[PDB]
Amino acid sequence: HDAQHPCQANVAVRRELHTPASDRSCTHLEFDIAGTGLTYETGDHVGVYTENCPEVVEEAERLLGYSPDTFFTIHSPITVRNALARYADLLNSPKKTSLVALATYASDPAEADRLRFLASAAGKDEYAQWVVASQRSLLEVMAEFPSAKPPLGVFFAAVAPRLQPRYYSISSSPSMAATRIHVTCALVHETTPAGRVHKGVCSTWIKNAVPSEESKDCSWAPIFVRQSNFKLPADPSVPIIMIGPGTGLAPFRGFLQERLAQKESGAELGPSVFFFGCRNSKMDFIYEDELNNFLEQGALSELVLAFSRQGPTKEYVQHKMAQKASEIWDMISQGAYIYVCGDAKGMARDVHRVLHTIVQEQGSLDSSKAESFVKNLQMEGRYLRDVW
Numbered sequence: 001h002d003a004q005h006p007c008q009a010n011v012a013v014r015r016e017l018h019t020p021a022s023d024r025s026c027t028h029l030e031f032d033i034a035g036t037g038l039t040y041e042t043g044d045h046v047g048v049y050t051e052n053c054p055e056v057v058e059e060a061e062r063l064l065g066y067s068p069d070t071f072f073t074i075h076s077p078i079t080v081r082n083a084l085a086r087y088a089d090l091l092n093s094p095k096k097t098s099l100v101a102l103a104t105y106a107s108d109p110a111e112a113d114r115l116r117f118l119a120s121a122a123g124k125d126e127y128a129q130w131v132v133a134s135q136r137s138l139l140e141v142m143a144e145f146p147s148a149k150p151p152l153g154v155f156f157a158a159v160a161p162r163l164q165p166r167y168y169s170i171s172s173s174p175s176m177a178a179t180r181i182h183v184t185c186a187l188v189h190e191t192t193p194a195g196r197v198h199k200g201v202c203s204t205w206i207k208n209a210v211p212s213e214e215s216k217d218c219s220w221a222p223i224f225v226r227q228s229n230f231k232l233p234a235d236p237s238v239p240i241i242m243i244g245p246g247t248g249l250a251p252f253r254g255f256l257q258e259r260l261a262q263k264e265s266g267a268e269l270g271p272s273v274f275f276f277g278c279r280n281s282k283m284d285f286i287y288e289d290e291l292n293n294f295l296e297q298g299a300l301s302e303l304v305l306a307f308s309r310q311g312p313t314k315e316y317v318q319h320k321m322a323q324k325a326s327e328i329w330d331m332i333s334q335g336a337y338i339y340v341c342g343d344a345k346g347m348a349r350d351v352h353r354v355l356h357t358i359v360q361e362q363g364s365l366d367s368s369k370a371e372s373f374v375k376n377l378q379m380e381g382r383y384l385r386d387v388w
């Protein structure tokens, strides 16, 4: 019932979205909010509190040397083991103030000197490479310096920051489902430059959550809702363009549920065009069936697709945007809103760059005018991005 403070909501359904032939995974999850004061609007975000994997917690317990059977008041009582699971960010990289604190408690002079060094101005380049670039966890830094043994209070006050909640762009509309909060969540699983195997904290928890639809002893999590400006226009007559691939599809599923929801009790839809992208029609084409239904009805006018690993061609959403550069510019002159959701470092940037180019050819403006023009779709509120 608060952004800072969560509501114990349960997991009703949890399903894999990829096919058994997919090499990756994407979970569809539904939070049951019946009887909770939680309310949400299309395009809003849901924050989720999660916990650490037990192996990671155990490595911390090894390193810290506490009795897990100690109870204590995190600034009502809790055990060391549960505090590490739910309140300690163990896997991100220690800030410099956290290294300072470890050094204070490092009984090896050389280890204590190295910790203090990495936190000093003199050590900034080294910190950037050995800690940040390599994505070394608090648990690794601590193993590198085993004489650093901070007391329980310091550890939670200065060494480990709290385990932040993870945000997901809600993928359902309240009209279609006012009792369920829908999330679409890619399983994260990387290897750091230093070679640590990292399981995404919240995306692994979601992947393995037990839903009430398969057992009574079901999973639950403290959730909460964050209002966003990623909202549909006032009236359906306004034409809209939705661009996100992969999990960038999430908000638009709510968008299409909302169009349809209004559509049953309302006016004709404006043209809807959705650019989707994924690896293979037979692997990660999440929500395929639902999308064709949205087409059979009037929810979405059209669904361009981009498959980047299936077939000879590496097709991306922006590549499918340039081919359709004529129709979308017409959409702009008709007053269309444009939505971009998904990966922020590559796709959004690439899509942003493509957008600037399309106006030049289909608008006859120079680079500066195009830039100012696009900047002005943003200010007007017609160009929206939900990226991460």
Ligand SMILES: Cc1cc2nc3c(=O)[nH]c(=O)nc-3n(C[C@H](O)[C@H](O)[C@H](O)COP(=O)(O)OP(=O)(O)OC[C@H]3O[C@@H](n4cnc5c(N)ncnc54)[C@H](O)[C@@H]3O)c2cc1C
Binding pocket: 045, 091, 092, 093, 134, 135, 136, 137, 166, 167, 168, 169, 184, 185, 186, 187, 188, 190, 191, 192, 198, 199, 200, 201, 202, 203, 204, 247, 250, 387, 388
């Ligand atoms: C507004 C918003 C909406 C979102 N919507 C969605 C959505 O709809 N679907 C979805 O799947 N996700 C979404 N995300 C992203 C999501 O919130 C999480 O970031 C993502 O799921 C990973 O969560 P995780 O806890 O599992 O991974 P984490 O455990 O947080 O890991 C995150 C990344 O950090 C890397 N990492 C590991 N160790 C280190 C280190 N020491 N230093 C630096 N980096 C390290 C990992 O390799 C990994 O790539 C959204 C994010 C935002 C902000």
Ligand SMILES: NC(=O)c1ccc[n+]([C@@H]2O[C@H](COP(=O)([O-])OP(=O)(O)OC[C@H]3O[C@@H](n4cnc5c(N)ncnc54)[C@H](OP(=O)(O)O)[C@@H]3O)[C@@H](O)[C@H]2O)c1
Binding pocket: 186, 187, 188, 245, 246, 247, 248, 277, 278, 279, 307, 308, 309, 316, 317, 318, 342, 343, 346, 347, 348, 350
């Ligand atoms: N390499 C990266 O830096 C990168 C990019 C995106 C996501 N991720 C990670 O992978 C996980 C799943 O994310 P997701 O499901 O949204 O991503 P995804 O499934 O990897 O991406 C879906 C589609 O987006 C395509 N794509 C990749 N780069 C693109 C670009 N620059 N422009 C346009 N399209 C592009 C992918 O192509 P290909 O995959 O065939 O290249 C794929 O076809 C996330 O946890 C995320 O952190 C990593």
